[model samples]
Target chain A: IVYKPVDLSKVTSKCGSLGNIHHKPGGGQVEVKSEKLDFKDRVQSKIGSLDNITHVPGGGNKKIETHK
Target chain B: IVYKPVDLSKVTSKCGSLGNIHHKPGGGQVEVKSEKLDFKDRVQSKIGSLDNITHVPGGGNKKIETHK
Candidate 1:
């Protein structure tokens, strides 16, 4: 769908033109079940890191105002 | 969080404003691990019925446009 393995860490970074990340200053659940990958490091994606659940992990995200 | 028991049934019914439901013209995975709730009936919420994956279940939903 939306670049699944988006690597979320830089989800807050201005990626070329399609800047992105969750808009609202809110946070949600983020779960990653793996054996090798350290969940703590990649917590900046999915629900937990979709948009800075805690600290302002600034990034150039976008949100098409089609639903505003 | 959000009104958990939002009852996706009327999610497209335009509540007292503040709007709701997923946007975008696409559908995603919707898993309901329940029995008594008749997954088919309540499929109109969550990912399945969040925003009419197929027919545009038109409703006054809002997107906040935080992530684009």
Candidate 2:
């Protein structure tokens, strides 16, 4: 379970937007907006790595295996 | 990101406590533990399935591959 801080204010609120699911936070509310479907991927660049886990400077994430 | 209601009072904190990471609610803090390792699997029995998503009569979770 990787994680990152998301600002809901930046969210556009659309369908299939949260499909990427960067962080499933706040009472099971999965957060990840297409701010690409119009999204920024916030810290998604280096998530699922030790960086995201240790709160380090993010070496990067699971997109390698899961996304691309 | 699938979800379930977990009672933290029922949790037993250990080293690999959050390793299973059920509901990563309240910021990035994840909630999953090994009560069977001393753990209850809380709602883990029927997680990661579409039931866990829709929160219906849960079909089950990621444990199929990730656990067993």
Candidate 3:
């Protein structure tokens, strides 16, 4: 959640010349509703699990080389 | 504008145990100044422009078929 703070005094003073402004003498506030997305699990499963592969060679066979 | 509400009594109590506890009886408040990026127009134009393509099949192809 993103939070913002405002100074009511500044706002009222900036607009004080407009009318019979009492300035209510309160703090300024604003709110925003937003959504956050998480992608950690997807990345871990796809890339992290692929690094564990191991291969074993046959025990009873002679090493053969086939190169032309 | 983003606004966050804080409990002043709680804050005062938390700090009161350390000194001459005069709560001064004030509400809790916080303010943050930030800049918001506007990207709605750029995204809309990028995807909206790709939907204007029209294609037609060839007309003068000779009919040919082989089966075994």
Candidate 4:
């Protein structure tokens, strides 16, 4: 059972623009707009090769493999 | 070109132990140990259905679908 569930609105406010999920043919890409988006990047970098994760440099939007 | 790269050691220090990625058959699971791991959860919840992400309730670790 899911808990209370996270509030997207609040999250967006705190972590900058944290939505705009586009499902592509192979995987999905997400756009996160923020002045300093180090928080997300830091986490993703650590999770690294394990998930076959990929990122688009410079842009806030990061393309990640959903399941690989 | 990739940037200097995120520092895992520093990340773990600030974010509280962020590592231990275990790749399962279908996907990969990560274990993040921290008293309050909201930082990671908050970001994941926002990226929701996009990546077919899943989390193990009550545990700091979360099981995510690498590519759907």
Candidate 5:
């Protein structure tokens, strides 16, 4: 997953401009506005959990953090 | 880019207990006998290069991948 600092100020301007689109299960499409491109949560959930993993630059360490 | 499933008779007692050193502009961080953790060619070569696009996990198809 990619972690990019979000500039709240540009949230509306940038996200608002995006035209939402929906594709049918078979075929077709639609459009909308605004989207959440989360990397951390997405990656964590997709793989395992953030607590057990840290997003190091070159993938290092294995000290799984214990949740509170 | 995380896909684990490599067990070739405990490769050199687990990658030879990695422990190498070297640092400069990269601040040195090397310790490895053998470890290759690749994920789909590093996320399609850092995002963009599967015949202009085509690696959908849920989305519909686009037909690319014409690399002959």
Candidate 6:
């Protein structure tokens, strides 16, 4: 368990191929009765926005290989 | 928009070093009134579980560099 809230500005992320992200890019179901969430920094490498992400198996892209 | 529900079983993701991931690893605020969520296959490289993730800015790891 973490005691303090993590600083988003300090956060950094790096990733490779992100191979075959298979999921709905948009459209799902979300019925939030109540929510109090906060986000820092612009969402990156993300499908939906920071406010809403109703899709299941979220995040994906077309598959292609790099070669001649 | 996705026509049909995304098949989580087919989902594939690859990423490099997710650097300096911030935010609380555990413990946050969540009050779901109504929801219908479905998950397929085992969750990988995830901080929390398929059920709940109250923390902000999720996913992180310790810092270290490779050396000779």
lDDT of 1 at B5: 20
lDDT digits (tens) for residues A1-68 of candidate 1: 32221111211221111222222332233233333332222122222221111122232244233211
Among these predictions, the greatest lDDT belongs to 6
TM-score of chain A of each: 0.18, 0.13, 0.14, 0.15, 0.14, 0.18
True contacts kept of each: 0.02, 0.04, 0.03, 0.04, 0.00, 0.05
The CA lDDT at A11 in model 5 is 9
Give the Å error, residue A29, model 5. 40
Identify the runs in model 1 with alpha carbons over 4 angstroms from their true place: A1-32, A39-43, A48-68, B1-26, B30-68
lDDT of 6 by residue, A1-68 (tens): 22322222222332332222323332233223424433343422222122212222322244322211
List model 3 lDDT by residue over A47-67, tens digit each.
111111212221121222221
Supply candidate 4's per-residue lDDT for B40.
33
Candidate 2 stretches with Cα past 4 Å from truth are A1-68, B1-27, B35-68
DockQ for every model comes to 0.03, 0.03, 0.02, 0.03, 0.02, 0.05
Candidate 5 lDDT, A1-68, residue by residue in tens: 33322221110111111232222211122222323432222121111111111121221212121211
Query: Worst ten-residue run, lDDT, model 3 chain A?
Result: A10-19
Q: Candidate 5's error at B24, in angstroms?
A: 2.2
> What is the DockQ score of candidate 1, to 2 decimals?
0.03
- Scored against the true structure, residue A53 in model 3 reaches a CA lDDT of 21
Q: Tell me how candidate 3 scores on lDDT.
A: 0.22
Per-residue C-alpha lDDT of model 5 across residues B1-68, encoded as one tens digit per residue: 33333222211111111232212111122222323343322121111111111121221112111111
- Which model, 5 or 6, shows the larger DockQ? 6
Candidate 6 C-alpha error for residue B4, in Å:
61
Compute the lDDT of residue B28 as modeled in candidate 4.
Answer: 26
Per model, how many backbone clashes are there? 8, 14, 4, 6, 4, 7
Q: Point out the higher-scoring one by DockQ: 3 or 5.
A: 3
TM-score of model 2 (CA atoms): 0.12
Sort the candidates on lDDT, descending order.
Answer: 6, 4, 1, 2, 3, 5
RMSD, every candidate, angstroms: 24.8, 28.1, 37.1, 28.0, 30.4, 24.6
Measured with DockQ on alpha carbons, how good is candidate 3?
0.02
Q: What global local distance difference test value does model 4 have?
A: 0.25
